[PDB]
Design an enzyme around this catalytic site. Structure first.
Site, PDB file in Angstrom:
ATOM      1  N   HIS A   1      64.133  78.510  76.959  1.00 34.50           N
ATOM      2  CA  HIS A   1      63.403  78.683  78.209  1.00 34.50           C
ATOM      3  C   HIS A   1      63.545  77.471  79.124  1.00 34.50           C
ATOM      4  O   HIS A   1      63.525  77.625  80.349  1.00 34.50           O
ATOM      5  CB  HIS A   1      61.930  79.031  77.941  1.00 34.50           C
ATOM      6  CG  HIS A   1      61.091  77.898  77.433  1.00 34.50           C
ATOM      7  ND1 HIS A   1      60.115  77.290  78.199  1.00 34.50           N
ATOM      8  CD2 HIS A   1      61.053  77.293  76.222  1.00 34.50           C
ATOM      9  CE1 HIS A   1      59.531  76.339  77.490  1.00 34.50           C
ATOM     10  NE2 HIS A   1      60.075  76.328  76.286  1.00 34.50           N
TER      11      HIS A   1
ATOM     12  N   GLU B   1      79.228  58.158  84.499  1.00 32.28           N
ATOM     13  CA  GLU B   1      78.969  59.418  83.807  1.00 32.28           C
ATOM     14  C   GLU B   1      77.488  59.815  83.907  1.00 32.28           C
ATOM     15  O   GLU B   1      76.608  58.974  83.683  1.00 32.28           O
ATOM     16  CB  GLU B   1      79.379  59.300  82.346  1.00 32.28           C
ATOM     17  CG  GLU B   1      79.002  60.484  81.534  1.00 32.28           C
ATOM     18  CD  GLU B   1      79.537  60.437  80.112  1.00 32.28           C
ATOM     19  OE1 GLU B   1      79.993  59.361  79.661  1.00 32.28           O
ATOM     20  OE2 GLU B   1      79.480  61.495  79.445  1.00 32.28           O
TER      21      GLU B   1
ATOM     22  N   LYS C   1      81.881  56.798  70.572  1.00 32.78           N
ATOM     23  CA  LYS C   1      82.003  56.840  72.028  1.00 32.78           C
ATOM     24  C   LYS C   1      80.628  56.896  72.682  1.00 32.78           C
ATOM     25  O   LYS C   1      80.378  56.205  73.675  1.00 32.78           O
ATOM     26  CB  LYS C   1      82.855  58.053  72.450  1.00 32.78           C
ATOM     27  CG  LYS C   1      83.342  58.062  73.911  1.00 32.78           C
ATOM     28  CD  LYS C   1      82.264  58.540  74.910  1.00 32.78           C
ATOM     29  CE  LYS C   1      82.840  58.831  76.298  1.00 32.78           C
ATOM     30  NZ  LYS C   1      81.799  59.327  77.262  1.00 32.78           N
TER      31      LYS C   1
ATOM     32  N   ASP D   1      83.638  41.068  79.338  1.00 34.44           N
ATOM     33  CA  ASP D   1      84.873  41.801  79.048  1.00 34.44           C
ATOM     34  C   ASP D   1      84.554  43.016  78.187  1.00 34.44           C
ATOM     35  O   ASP D   1      84.312  42.879  76.984  1.00 34.44           O
ATOM     36  CB  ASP D   1      85.844  40.860  78.332  1.00 34.44           C
ATOM     37  CG  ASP D   1      87.205  41.497  78.008  1.00 34.44           C
ATOM     38  OD1 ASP D   1      87.326  42.736  77.846  1.00 34.44           O
ATOM     39  OD2 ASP D   1      88.171  40.720  77.892  1.00 34.44           O
TER      40      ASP D   1
END
Ligand SMILES: NC(=O)c1ccc[n+]([C@@H]2O[C@H](COP(=O)([O-])OP(=O)(O)OC[C@H]3O[C@@H](n4cnc5c(N)ncnc54)[C@H](O)[C@@H]3O)[C@@H](O)[C@H]2O)c1
Ligand SMILES: NC(=O)c1ccc[n+]([C@@H]2O[C@H](COP(=O)([O-])OP(=O)(O)OC[C@H]3O[C@@H](n4cnc5c(N)ncnc54)[C@H](O)[C@@H]3O)[C@@H](O)[C@H]2O)c1
Lengths: 376, 427
Positions: free
Chosen positions: B380, B82, B266, B282
Site C-alpha cells: 500500500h 545517485e 558497492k 582521494d
C-alpha cells in the site's frame, strides 16, 4: 575530422582551453557559456537528484588529449582532484599514438539481475525446473520495458546457481542475463527481477527475498590493448629496452603481490573514475565491478597484463567489467555530463566502456613507467 | 552541545538547509557566503590542482543527519549524484540513535611503503640481513620528516616478504610501517621508500626498483558497530523480528556469493565515497583499500557482518582500511573541503575514518532492510507513492521511477514528487 591532439595546453589559460574545446568540438554558444560560468548544475536540479541538498561540490574538470581508439580520436574529460593524473594519461596516449593508438573491444551490454529464493528443500531439482521454464521467465521479464525491447535489449538468458548449505538454509539464485543497450542498467534490471518473482516462486515453491543486479558485471567486459616499441619508449638517459624491462619488473610485482596489485589497480582507477564522474555515471558501481573482478582468481591481482611481443615491443592489455551508460541515471540530467559525452561524441555505451578501458591502461602504464624510471 | 538532528529538512529549500547548517555549526559570514554562491572552487585554484583544466564539475552536496559516533553528534556532508543514498544514511542513523548511535574505533594510522628489491640470488638469507638491520633502516626512514616525528608518527617497524620464484627473478619486498598521524600519508611514505633505497641496496646486494605505498592499508583499519532492537525496526506493515530475519537473509547471501557481495560492498561505498569526496580525500585510494581487503580470505566477500545478540537485537559490524587525512592533498586546498572538515568538527584523521565506516555501515543497513522488506507484490505504500507521482503530473514510465525515488527517500509527498519529476524532465 575529430582530433584529440591538444596544442600546448599546459601553456594556455583555462579560458583558452575552454574556447579551444568549444571550437574543436562544435559546442553551441549556450554550451560555451555553460562552461564559462560556475554553477552549471542548478541548485534546484541538484535538489531533485539527491536528498538534504544544501549546495554543490566542485571537482577540477580537465581533459586528457591524444587518445586514439580503434582508429578514432577521442577527447577525454576528467573530473578529479589529484595532480599528475590527467598529464600522465595524455602523455601515455601520445606514446600510444605511434603504434596507431589503442585497440579495444567489448562484449554485449549484458547485466546480471539476481533473484534470491529461500525455503526450497530441493534446490537442485528446482534449479532444473527453472531452467526448463526459461522461455516463460524471459517472456515475463520482457513484457514491461517497451523502449529497451524496441531497441533490441531485454532479457536474453537465465542462469541458476544453488547454495545448498547456508546458515539461512538453501538458497536458489536466478540470474537474469539482460541486454541493457546504452544504459548502465541497474534500475532497468532490478525491475525485471521484481517482475519475475511471483513466477519464480510458483515454479520453485520458495520465497523470493532479494531482487537486485549484481555489480560483478563480468558479462559486460571492456578490453583494450596497446603496443609500444623500444624506439617509442627510449628517452635521452634510458634506452627503450631498459624502460621495457623495468615495466615488466613492475607489472610482475603487481601480478604476484596483492599489496602491490591494490596500488597498481588504484592507478588504473585514477584513469577510469574521472571519466565516469565527468559523464554523470555511477563511479561506485564501476569501482566495485573492477576490484571484484580483480580477485576472480582466488587472489587479488592486477587487472592489466604487460608483455613483450616477438620483436621486443611492450604489449599491455586490460579486461574488466564496464557498466556505464549514455542514458539513464545522471548521464543526461547533469548539463556537464551531457556536455562531456558530446565532447567524446559516442554512439554506444560499449564505446564509452572501451574508451574507459584504454584510459585505465594508459594510466597504469604511466605509473609503471614513472615508478621504474625514477632514480635512486 | 553538538546536534546532528535536521528537523523538517525534507521540507526546507537548499537555501534554508544552508542557513540552518551555518547557524548550527557557527560558520563565519565568509563561510556562509562561500556556500551561498556557486564557484567555491575558483578556476585559478582548480588550475593548480590537476592538469589541462578547462572548468569545474559539480556534484550535488547534501548532508546526512542523525549520526552519533561514540556519543558525539556529527553532521556528515555527502557529495554524490545517485538518488536516495543521503536519505538512507540519515534514516538508518536515526534508527541507530535509539541504541545510542554507533560505537567505533580504529588502529594506529599505519601505512605501508614497499621497496621492491630485484637481482638478489639468496632472497631468504638477505631478508634476514635486512631484518637484522631493522634499527638502522628505521632511523634512515625517519631522518628527513622532522614535523612528523615531532607529532609522534614516523617509521615504526619493517617487514620483509620474499617471492623467490617469479618470471622476473626473485623479489624481496621491504615494507616500511609508518605512522602518518593525520595525513593520508602517500607522499610521506613514498619519500621514506626513496630514502632507504641505497641502504637496502647495500644490505641485500640487489637493485631497488619500485618505492611506493601499498593502497592495501590493512594496518589502518576503521571499525564500527551498531545495535537495533526489534522494537526500533518495527513498522506498521512488518514486525521488527521479520525485518531482522530478512536482513540476515540478505547478509548471508553476500557472505557466500561474490556476485552479491560486490553489490553489497558497492552499497557500503555509496555511504563512504561521498564523505571522502566532500572532505577533499582521494576516493580511488579508499575504494582500492576496501575492495582489496574484501578478498583477503581468498574469496571476494562482504565487508560487514550482521548477527543477532542474546536478546534478539540486530547487530551490524564493519572493519576496513580507511586511509584518509585532514592535512595534505586537496583537503586543505579546496575551500569546501576545508569547510566540510569544520562542519564535521574533526579532531583527527582516525576520527574521520571511524565516522565514514559508520556511514558505510548505515548505508549497508538501509539497502539490506529495503531489499529484504520490499513486497513481492506492490504494497500500500508503493501504491500510495504511485498516486502521489500521478497527482504531481507524472506519466508513462515516469510514474514508477518517481514513486521509486520517493519511497526510497521516505519523502512521499507531492512537493517532493514535483522536485523529483522536474529532475527527470531535465533529460
Ligand atoms: N548497485 C548499483 O549499481 C545500483 C543499484 C540501484 C540503482 N543504481 C542507480 O541506477 C541508476 C542507473 O539505472 P539505469 O542504467 O537502469 O538507468 P535509468 O533507470 O535512469 O533508465 C533506464 C531506462 O532507460 C530506457 N532507455 C531509453 N533509451 C535507452 C537506451 N539506448 N539503452 C538502454 N535503455 C534505454 C529504457 O527503457 C530503460 O529502462 C544510477 O543512478 C545508479 O546509481 C545503482
Ligand atoms: N596510490 C595512492 O593512494 C597515491 C599515490 C601517490 C600520491 N597520492 C596522493 O598523495 C597525496 C597525499 O599524501 P600525504 O597524506 O602525505 O599529503 P602531503 O603530501 O601534504 O604530506 C603530508 C605532510 O604534511 C606534514 N604534516 C603536517 N601536519 C601533519 C599531521 N597532523 N599529520 C601528519 N603529517 C602532517 C607532514 O610533514 C607530512 O609529511 C594525495 O593527494 C594522494 O592523491 C596517492
Amino acid at each position: 575530422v575529430a582530433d584529440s591532439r591538444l596544442p600546448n595546453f599546459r601553456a594556455l589559460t583555462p579560458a583558452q582551453r575552454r574556447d579551444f574545446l568549444a571550437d574543436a568540438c562544435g559546442l553551441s554558444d549556450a554550451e560555451r557559456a555553460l562552461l564559462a560560468a560556475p554553477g552549471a548544475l542548478p541548485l534546484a536540479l541538484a535538489d531533485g537528484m539527491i536528498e538534504n541538498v544544501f549546495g554543490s561540490f566542485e571537482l577540477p574538470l580537465g581533459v586528457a588529449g591524444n587518445f586514439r581508439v580503434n582508429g578514432r580520436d577521442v577527447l577525454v574529460p576528467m573530473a578529479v582532484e589529484e595532480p599528475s593524473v590527467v598529464a600522465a594519461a595524455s602523455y601515455m596516449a601520445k606514446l600510444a599514438r605511434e603504434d596507431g593508438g589503442f585497440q579495444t573491444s567489448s562484449t554485449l551490454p549484458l547485466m546480471r539481475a539476481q533473484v534470491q529464493v529461500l525455503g526450497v528443500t530441493d534446490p537442485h531439482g528446482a534449479r532444473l525446473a527453472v531452467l526448463q521454464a526459461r522461455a516463460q521467465i524471459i517472456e515475463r521479464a520482457n513484457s514491461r520495458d517497451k523502449v529497451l525491447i524496441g531497441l533490441g535489449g531485454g532479457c536474453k538468458d537465465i542462469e541458476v546457481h544453488v547454495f545448498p548449505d547456508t546458515p539461512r538454509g538453501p538458497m536458489l539464485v536466478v540470474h537474469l542475463i539482460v541486454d541493457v543497450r546504452d544504459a548502465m542498467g541497474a534500475n532497468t534490471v532490478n525491475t525485471m527481477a521484481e517482475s519475475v518473482a511471483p513466477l519464480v516462486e510458483k515454479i520453485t515453491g520458495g520465497s523470493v527475498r532479494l531482487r537486485i543486479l549484481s555489480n560483478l558485471a563480468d558479462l559486460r567486459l571492456a578490453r583494450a590493448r596497446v603496443r609500444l616499441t623500444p624506439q617509442t619508449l627510449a628517452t635521452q638517459d634510458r634506452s627503450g629496452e631498459e624502460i621495457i624491462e623495468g615495466v615488466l619488473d613492475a607489472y610482475t610485482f603487481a601480478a604476484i603481490d596483492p599489496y602491490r596489485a591494490a596500488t597498481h589497480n588504484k592507478g588504473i582507477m585514477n584513469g577510469i573514475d574521472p571519466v565516469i564522474v565527468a559523464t554523470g555515471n555511477d563511479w561506485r558501481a564501476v569501482e566495485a565491478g573492477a576490484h571484484a573482478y580483480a580477485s576472480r582468481s582466488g587472489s587479488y591481482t592486477s587487472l592489466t597484463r604487460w608483455e613483450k611481443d616477438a620483436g621486443g615491443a611492450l604489449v599491455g592489455s586490460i579486461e574488466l567489467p564496464m557498466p556505464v551508460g549514455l542514458v539513464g541515471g545522471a548521464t543526461k540530467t547533469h548539463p556537464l555530463a551531457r556536455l562531456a559525452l558530446k565532447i567524446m561524441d559516442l554512439q554506444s555505451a560499449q564505446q564509452l566502456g572501451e574508451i574507459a578501458a584504454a584510459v585505465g591502461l594508459a594510466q597504469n602504464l604511466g605509473a609503471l613507467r614513472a615508478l621504474a624510471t625514477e632514480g635512486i
